[PDB]
Design a protein around this ligand. Structure first.
Ligand SMILES: O=c1ccn([C@@H]2CCC[C@H]2OCP(=O)(O)O)c(=O)[nH]1
Ligand SMILES: [Mg+2]
Length: 195
C-alpha cells in the first residue's frame, strides 16, 4: 500500500539551534546583553535581539553565518534515535526538510555533513533543502516554526508544531497539534495519518 511520508525539520527539531546560538553568542560577545531561552519569544532570534539593543541583530546573525556553527550544533535529546526508528518503520518514508540561511558559504555543506555524522551516508538522499516547504508534498511536517507559508496555499501535509522555547506559550487554533519533544508519542501522530 501507500507509504506514509513524513518531513522533519532540522533547526529546532533535530539540531539545537537555540542553545548553540546562545552559547556561541555569549562566548564571542560577553559584553552584550543576551536572551535566556526561557525568555525567547517569536520565531526569529535576530528580531528579538534587534529590540534588545541597536546593533545586536547584526551581531546575532554573525554567529550563525560563522564557519562551523551548523556543523557543531548538538542533537536535541532523543531526536537521532527517534528519526532512525521512524525511518526503519514499515510503510514510512522520512525526509529532512530544512532551509539554508541567506549567506550560503557554509550552511548547506555543514547541514549535509551534520546529517552524515548522525545518520550515516545513506541518509543523505533523504535531505530536501528549500526555503519553501509548502511545495514539498507529504502527509506530515514536524517543524518548530508556527506559521509556515509559501507558494502553495494548500499544502498536502499536516503541520505538527514541535515545541521550542520561542513557541511554548503559544495557543494554537484547533485542530492544530503539537509534538512536545522526541520523548512524546510521535508514533501515535504518524499512526493517526495512516490508511
Ligand atoms: O532565528 C532563526 C534563524 C534561522 N533559523 C534557521 C537556520 C537555517 C535557516 C533558518 O530556517 C528556518 P525554516 O525555513 O523555518 O527551516 C532559525 O531556525 N531561527
Ligand atoms: Mg526549525
Amino acid at each position: 500500500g501507500r507509504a506514509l511520508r513524513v518531513l522533519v525539520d532540522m533547526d529546532g527539531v533535530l539540531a539545537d539551534f537555540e542553545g548553540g546560538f546562545l552559547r556561541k553568542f555569549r562566548a564571542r560577545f560577553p559584553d552584550q546583553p543576551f536572551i535566556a531561552l526561557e525568555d525567547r519569544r517569536g520565531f526569529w532570534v535576530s528580531e528579538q535581539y534587534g529590540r534588545l539593543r541597536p546593533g545586536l541583530s547584526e551581531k546575532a546573525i554573525s554567529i550563525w553565518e560563522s564557519k562551523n556553527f551548523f556543523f557543531e550544533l548538538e542533537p536535541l535529546p532523543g531526536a537521532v534515535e527517534a528519526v532512525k526508528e521512524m525511518a526503519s518503520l514499515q510503510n514510512t518514508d522520512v525526509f529532512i526538510c530544512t532551509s539554508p540561511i541567506k549567506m550560503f558559504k557554509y550552511c548547506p555543506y555543514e547541514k549535509y555533513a551534520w546529517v552524515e555524522k548522525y545518520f550515516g551516508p545513506d541518509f543523505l538522499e533523504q535531505i530536501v533543502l528549500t526555503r519553501d516547504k509548502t511545495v514539498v508534498s507529504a502527509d506530515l511536517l514536524i517543524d518548530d516554526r508556527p506559521d509556515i507559508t509559501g507558494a502553495e496555499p494548500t499544502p498536502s501535509w499536516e503541520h505538527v508544531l514541535f515545541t521550542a522555547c520561542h513557541n511554548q506559550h503559544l495557543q494554537l487554533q484547533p485542530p492544530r497539534r503539537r509534538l512536545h519533544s522526541w520523548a512524546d508519542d510521535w508514533k501515535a501522530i504518524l499512526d493517526s495519518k495512516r490508511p
